[PDB]
């Protein structure tokens, strides 16, 4: 029902697995989304110093249409960029974050801004910015049972079991989706500025997916396709619960099974995202970037197979 914030000690933290199943224990996935807040001794890496030069193979300018809080979201890819050169075109005057009392300031800003000048995403980038050092909560070698996708059918899906980078601006969004076979999804926000996070808990998943094809008749399961933006205020207005979640940056959070979740950056930002799964998914994967059952099934549910 309303969206936990964990804050684990160093101990609690090593092992990544255990530490899901425990959130879950205390109902974390209900909401849909949860924040972890890590032990204070802990880093992703040491420094971001030398980071300007990575490249940006193909960053997306985002164009939205609509009106009243119901917005298609189209990409155009642009030519390549380096981190230097966005970041620069993030501050300047044309894409810098508006002028803001507070989060509900520039949240009602956002909301209000769209249609608008078209902010440029440089999302999806193959890469990570952890250390090897990191030993906890390395979103490179979380450990879970997804590994078996490569382990056993030689799978590599970039972005779903290897990681993404997310370099942001203000106003960029990430529309309404699930993730991929009905995956977790785990997101740490290096540095920046933050992201605003809205989840429609698990439960009430089918509402937002009616409500969906009711106001989107033309494109209408297109919500995994990350394409519609549909206002708190619409939500509300048509009864559909949902949390608001700002991350900043040095936390994480965590999606679970069949959590619709959208959002947007306040700012110019910096982070990365991979896939997960627990054995609580496979009945989920089941159901359901499409690949096959069959490892997890085998191994994780030999009894059932
Ligand atoms: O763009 C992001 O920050 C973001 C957030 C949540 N999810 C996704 C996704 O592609 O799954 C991307
Ligand atoms: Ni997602």
């Known amino acids: ?37 890590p032990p204070k001794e802990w880093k992703a890496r040491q420094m971001y110093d030398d980071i300007e ?13 609509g009106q009243g809080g119901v917005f298609t979201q189209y990409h155009k890819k642009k ?3 380096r981190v230097g050169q966005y970041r620069r075109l993030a501050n300047s005057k044309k894409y810098q974050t508006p002028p803001h009392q507070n989060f509900a300031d520039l949240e ?20 990570s910015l952890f250390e090897e050092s990191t030993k906890q909560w390395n979103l490179g070698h979380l450990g879970t049972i997804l590994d078996l996708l490569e382990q056993e059918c030689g799978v590599v899906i970039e972005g779903v079991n290897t990681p993404y980078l997310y370099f942001g601006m203000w106003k960029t969004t990430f529309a309404w989706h699930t993730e991929d076979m009905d995956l977790y999804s785990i ?7 933050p992201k605003t996070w809205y989840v429609v808990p698990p439960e009430h998943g089918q509402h937002l997916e009616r409500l969906a094809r009711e106001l989107f008749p033309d494109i209408s399961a297109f919500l995994r396709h990350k394409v519609a933006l549909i206002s708190p205020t619409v939500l509300k207005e048509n009864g559909i619960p949902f949390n608001c979640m700002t991350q900043e940056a040095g936390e994480f959070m965590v999606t679970f099974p069949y959590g619709y979740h959208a959002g947007f950056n306040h700012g110019f930002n910096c982070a990365e995202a991979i896939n997960f799964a627990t054995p609580r998914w496979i009945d989920y994967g089941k159901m359901a970037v499409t690949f096959s059952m069959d490892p997890f099934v085998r191994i994780v549910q030999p009894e059932s197979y």
């Open 1 to 37: 029902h309303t969206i936990m914030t964990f804050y684990p000690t160093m101990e609690e933290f090593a092992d990544f697995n255990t530490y899901v199943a425990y959130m879950e224990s205390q109902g974390a996935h209900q909401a849909g989304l949860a924040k972890v807040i």
């Open 53 to 65: 030069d990575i490249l940006i193979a193909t960053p997306l300018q985002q164009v939205t249409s």
């Open 79 to 81: 030519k390549a960029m």
């Open 108 to 127: 009602q800003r956002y909301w209000k801004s769209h249609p608008g000048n078209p902010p440029i995403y440089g999302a999806d980038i193959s890469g």
């Open 187 to 193: 997101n740490y926000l290096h540095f920046g500025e």
